[PDB]
Design a protein around this motif. Sequence first.
Motif, PDB file in Angstrom:
ATOM      1  N   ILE A 191      43.545  52.899  43.934  1.00  0.00           N
ATOM      2  CA  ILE A 191      44.361  54.716  43.942  1.00  0.00           C
ATOM      3  C   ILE A 191      45.823  53.601  44.575  1.00  0.00           C
ATOM      4  O   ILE A 191      46.747  54.503  45.035  1.00  0.00           O
ATOM      5  CB  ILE A 191      43.838  55.303  45.471  1.00  0.00           C
ATOM      6  N   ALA A 192      46.718  52.856  43.858  1.00  0.00           N
ATOM      7  CA  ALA A 192      47.214  51.926  45.138  1.00  0.00           C
ATOM      8  C   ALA A 192      47.813  51.919  45.595  1.00  0.00           C
ATOM      9  O   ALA A 192      47.255  52.271  46.322  1.00  0.00           O
ATOM     10  CB  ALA A 192      49.083  52.719  43.346  1.00  0.00           C
ATOM     11  N   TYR A 193      49.004  52.054  46.179  1.00  0.00           N
ATOM     12  CA  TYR A 193      49.993  51.708  47.473  1.00  0.00           C
ATOM     13  C   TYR A 193      51.200  51.895  47.787  1.00  0.00           C
ATOM     14  O   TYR A 193      51.117  53.394  47.207  1.00  0.00           O
ATOM     15  CB  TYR A 193      49.476  49.903  48.235  1.00  0.00           C
ATOM     16  CG  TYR A 193      50.149  49.397  47.426  1.00  0.00           C
ATOM     17  CD1 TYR A 193      49.990  48.852  46.505  1.00  0.00           C
ATOM     18  CD2 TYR A 193      51.731  49.074  48.219  1.00  0.00           C
ATOM     19  CE1 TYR A 193      51.111  48.220  46.084  1.00  0.00           C
ATOM     20  CE2 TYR A 193      52.776  47.932  47.663  1.00  0.00           C
ATOM     21  CZ  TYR A 193      51.841  47.337  46.594  1.00  0.00           C
ATOM     22  OH  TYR A 193      52.709  46.062  45.366  1.00  0.00           O
TER      23      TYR A 193
ATOM     24  N   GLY B 283      47.126  43.343  41.175  1.00  0.00           N
ATOM     25  CA  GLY B 283      46.321  42.755  40.331  1.00  0.00           C
ATOM     26  C   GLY B 283      47.772  41.990  39.117  1.00  0.00           C
ATOM     27  O   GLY B 283      47.306  41.168  37.946  1.00  0.00           O
ATOM     28  N   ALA B 284      48.777  42.026  40.075  1.00  0.00           N
ATOM     29  CA  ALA B 284      50.296  40.711  39.102  1.00  0.00           C
ATOM     30  C   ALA B 284      49.170  39.220  40.012  1.00  0.00           C
ATOM     31  O   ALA B 284      48.748  39.034  40.675  1.00  0.00           O
ATOM     32  CB  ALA B 284      51.297  40.837  40.028  1.00  0.00           C
TER      33      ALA B 284
ATOM     34  N   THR C  74      38.769  43.008  45.401  1.00  0.00           N
ATOM     35  CA  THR C  74      39.217  43.539  43.947  1.00  0.00           C
ATOM     36  C   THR C  74      39.289  42.257  43.090  1.00  0.00           C
ATOM     37  O   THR C  74      38.919  42.036  43.422  1.00  0.00           O
ATOM     38  CB  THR C  74      40.747  43.884  44.091  1.00  0.00           C
ATOM     39  OG1 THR C  74      41.269  43.245  44.225  1.00  0.00           O
ATOM     40  CG2 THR C  74      40.639  44.806  45.530  1.00  0.00           C
ATOM     41  N   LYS C  75      39.141  43.089  41.605  1.00  0.00           N
ATOM     42  CA  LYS C  75      38.978  42.276  40.578  1.00  0.00           C
ATOM     43  C   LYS C  75      40.155  40.950  40.853  1.00  0.00           C
ATOM     44  O   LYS C  75      39.722  40.340  39.966  1.00  0.00           O
ATOM     45  CB  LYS C  75      39.283  43.284  39.562  1.00  0.00           C
ATOM     46  N   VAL C  76      41.709  41.673  41.692  1.00  0.00           N
ATOM     47  CA  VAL C  76      42.214  40.408  40.998  1.00  0.00           C
ATOM     48  C   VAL C  76      41.987  39.192  42.371  1.00  0.00           C
ATOM     49  O   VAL C  76      42.932  38.338  42.327  1.00  0.00           O
ATOM     50  CB  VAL C  76      43.499  40.612  41.076  1.00  0.00           C
ATOM     51  N   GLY C  77      41.049  39.268  43.632  1.00  0.00           N
ATOM     52  CA  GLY C  77      41.245  39.128  44.186  1.00  0.00           C
ATOM     53  C   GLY C  77      40.490  39.577  45.640  1.00  0.00           C
ATOM     54  O   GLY C  77      39.479  40.292  45.898  1.00  0.00           O
ATOM     55  N   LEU C  78      41.725  38.819  46.839  1.00  0.00           N
ATOM     56  CA  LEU C  78      40.999  39.804  48.484  1.00  0.00           C
ATOM     57  C   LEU C  78      42.338  39.721  49.045  1.00  0.00           C
ATOM     58  O   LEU C  78      42.964  39.272  48.450  1.00  0.00           O
ATOM     59  CB  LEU C  78      40.054  38.493  49.468  1.00  0.00           C
ATOM     60  CG  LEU C  78      38.736  38.508  48.824  1.00  0.00           C
ATOM     61  CD1 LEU C  78      38.708  37.047  49.894  1.00  0.00           C
ATOM     62  CD2 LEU C  78      38.018  39.114  50.129  1.00  0.00           C
TER      63      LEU C  78
END
Lengths: 106, 71, 88, 105, 124, 71
Positions: A39-41, A68-69, A92-96
């Motif tokens: 939900i972004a930030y 996700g960068a 998350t799918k990009v890590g922690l």
Amino acid sequence: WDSNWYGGRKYGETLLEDSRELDAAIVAENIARQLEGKIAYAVKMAIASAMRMGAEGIKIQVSGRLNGAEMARSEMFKEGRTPDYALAEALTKVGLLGIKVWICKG
Amino acid sequence: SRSLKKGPYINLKLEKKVLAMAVIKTWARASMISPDFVGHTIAVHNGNKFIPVFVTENMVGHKLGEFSPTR
Amino acid sequence: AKESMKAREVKRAKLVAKYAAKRAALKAEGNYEALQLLPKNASPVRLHNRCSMTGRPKGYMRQFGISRIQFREMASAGLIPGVKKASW
Amino acid sequence: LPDPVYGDVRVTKFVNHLMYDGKKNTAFSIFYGALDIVKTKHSEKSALEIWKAALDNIIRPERKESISMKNLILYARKRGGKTMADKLAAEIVDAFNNQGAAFKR
Amino acid sequence: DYINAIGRRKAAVARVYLSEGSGKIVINKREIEQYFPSSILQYIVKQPLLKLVAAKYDIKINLRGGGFKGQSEAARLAIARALVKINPDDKPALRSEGFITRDPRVVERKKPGRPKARKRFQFS
Amino acid sequence: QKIRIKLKSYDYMLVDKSAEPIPLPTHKRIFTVNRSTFVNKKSREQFELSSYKRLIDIYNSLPSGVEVEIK
RNA sequence: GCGAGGAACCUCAUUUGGGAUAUGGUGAAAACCGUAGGUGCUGCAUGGUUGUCGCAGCUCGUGCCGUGAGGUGAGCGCCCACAUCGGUAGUUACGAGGACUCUACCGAGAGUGGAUGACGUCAAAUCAGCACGGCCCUUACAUCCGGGGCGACCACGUGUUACAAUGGAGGGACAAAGGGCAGCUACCGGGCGACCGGAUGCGAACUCUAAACCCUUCCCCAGUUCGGAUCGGAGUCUGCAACUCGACUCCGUGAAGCUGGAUUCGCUAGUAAUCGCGCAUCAGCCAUGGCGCGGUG
Ligand SMILES: [K+]
């Protein structure tokens, strides 16, 4: 202290047994849940809610692979005078992602 | 040194094999040589090889791993 | 760390507790030609003090059963009762 | 600080200069032995006056006194001999006589 | 009965009971000439008495802690404030020589990362 | 005959409020650990664990964290 | 002198070899026989922690100036301990002088040490403390056990002893602060000694804590009554086991070393320099390391 038992020169088998809404931890977990839900930030909504229902000062820090960068970054979101503290982790799918929340109204 | 109240440290299985006794292979590097070992061929492990040792009366009283260098 | 480390530590503890009686009975007397017949795992000399949760075998603390890093983490978090931070 | 035998702060300061390793009574004993030897061998005035005259023989006045004491002690160490007091007494007698490697150095 | 005072210097506490007599200073149930065999240590303890008063007082002293120079200096402070209780007109005579002021210097704690308090490891 | 009650905890206010008393000397322990989780030494912080004990006596006859010995 | 604040086995990840995936006998053991895991890779994918930059300027609004890139009313910069004195407490401490632990004031008149570090750059360090995105191992990078290695032999860094008379030795006299005790130990003897063998208090205001100093005597400038490396013999412990590769105690042996070039490191007062005592991990210990405590100064 979170634990209030008494250990006299012996804390083993007791620490192991222990191991086995403007409230810092709750808002940190809410931000972590929003980050996991993508939900972004999130942090702006939390700051707005705190200012709406009466927080003297709130600071939020988010670190990790934001959006996700392929790079790490830590930005501050501070409102109020700020003249208690909680930590949360979002997988998350990009890590922690690490979320540090401070509320100075109490 | 090993205290006299305990006596020598001789491996029971190796001693039994020698008394019942060809080269005898062993990993007992810390075993002390006894007078019954004299006249026997004991192949001591060293880490990757079995160095043979012919037991003579002069060597009596020394650990079996002294006559088999590792490095 | 790892899982085989903790598994073999638990096995060593179980064997030591199983053989704690006969070893004492042989050690009180002068018997030594039979004290070497016990398994090497049964002796309590192969009992390292690992961390209770992480399993780190260095930096151990006897009072709490945890390493120094875990101790600092829980002392900052307030999980350990009584332990505070010196103002000086 | 008062001197224990004479009551002069200059003696205490000189013992402070002499002091090694944090041991002050040893330096006091060395100074008193040297002051006794300066009267036993050679020797007009008392030992204290002779020592003061030797210091005068050897810019702020405090700095002058400090550098004079340091020079006297350094050359006492430099000269040969067995006992340190037996050495140092030679520096007092020689600075009174105005000669030697200590003077004007 | 006995005018009482206390003195402290480093980790050494001295207690003095000054009564009318003729000298005879006794420390820890031992004579002052046999408890402190160094003439410098006896001069420090009996310093304020000679400043104003000796041979007119009998003094009993209890000592605990510290070393010989700490105890002798602590004993001197205790006697100095016991004499001002006997006469309030002797205060300037003792403060001028610097006897009633307590020195509060104690051994500094050893900071971590250094072998001593203010001594650091050699960098090079 | 008498009954002696010895309280001990890690909070002076807690024992003072619990004991409705001779104050015994406290037992302070100091733990020193490395701030970093790796080779960075010479950077340490101190954690203090204190134990406060009190004694009371009744001649001729509580919050969590206090242990009381009755003799 | 780092992660490591305890590498003989274990730790152990590294190497060689043997296995598997109730009693006997065979075996070095594991084991045999009959009756999900990874201490694998990626800190240039991360979280959380840490060191440096080494710091006085870090942000939020209005107007105005400039074609432009740009220039210029509010939020922010204490705590702990030590000194003096004044009221309450009395046991395993010495009836209230100290200790011990709770409170209240502390210069407008005749402070220190430490912790907090909004303000930071180094793609700085940490996948081997711990989680975790991706890739790679499954008849083996997984797993069990014996025996070896991490201790083998020129350069650099960090230390400990000395090279001596402000000293070494022998014999007497001294008086500390803190911290440990299922382990330390009161006392009797086997002992030259390390500590063994009978017993005694103690789970803690009963038990381990002095040396440098202060007297007396010898050594008299000698590689020595300085120095204590190396090597031979006897042992005492711990531990199943002390060869590789433990500590300690006796008896010998007695090395380099004569105060150190260019350069360089640490501090400004109970400070450097010195002297001893204690603790953490630990069966034992490599502890001369780390963390503290006091004497004289
Ligand atoms: K062990």
